[PDB]
Design a protein around this ligand. Structure first.
Ligand SMILES: Cc1cccc(CC(=O)Nc2ccon2)c1
Length: 186
């Protein structure tokens, strides 16, 4: 099936806990896969304009590890619950992708999660201004604008709203699309 095939692909890129004990400032993100209309989508947040770091930017759910977290995957799930109301029973964490090193002292660990079809986002307005889906296949043929560095523009055909996706967020989205969608019979 579509979902069994996605999970099988993802598991081949799982790094596991290999890098997890290293003494960094630690953050985790959840790359949430949603199946709608017979295709996979990624769920993105738009950060509240209130926040000091990157107000109004497109981001995956996530944040800083805290002492309660059993592991890095727990960080991602705790933060996702706080930001969009995603409960742990509503997500299957499939793998841990390559971590992202930033600022010389920080390590961001991305986890891919399969999201239950009955989940409905409840954006927490203190943290998130908006939540939206993008079809995973978009990231194979994105609309690129050079700002100099590359920026994706995605227009939601439901409402005509355009979102800008860039940086680590854009890079991770492409990675997930390659892993899941490369070399598939039609
Ligand atoms: C890609 C990336 C980079 C930095 C931090 C995060 C986690 C995060 O803060 N997600 C939030 C917060 C509010 O809405 N989404 C993710």
């Amino acid at each position: 099936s579509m979902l069994d095939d996605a999970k099988a692909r993802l598991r081949k890129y799982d790094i596991g806990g290999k890098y997890s004990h290293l003494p960094y400032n630690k953050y985790s993100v959840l790359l949430p896969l949603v199946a709608k209309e017979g295709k996979l989508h990624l769920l993105f947040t738009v950060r509240s304009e209130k926040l000091r770091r990157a107000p109004g930017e497109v981001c995956f759910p996530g944040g800083k590890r805290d002492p309660t977290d059993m592991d890095d995957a727990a960080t991602a799930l705790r933060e996702a619950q706080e930001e969009v109301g995603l409960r742990p029973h509503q997500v299957e964490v499939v793998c841990c992708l390559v971590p992202c090193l930033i600022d010389t002292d920080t390590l961001i660990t991305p986890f891919v999660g399969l999201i239950d079809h009955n989940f409905q986002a409840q954006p927490n307005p203190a943290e998130v201004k908006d939540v939206f889906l993008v079809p995973l296949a978009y990231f194979l043929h994105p609309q690129v604008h050079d700002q100099i560095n590359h920026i994706f523009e995605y227009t939601n055909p439901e409402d005509g709203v355009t979102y800008q996706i860039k940086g680590m967020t854009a890079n991770l989205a492409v990675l997930v699309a390659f892993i899941i969608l490369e070399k598939k019979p039609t």
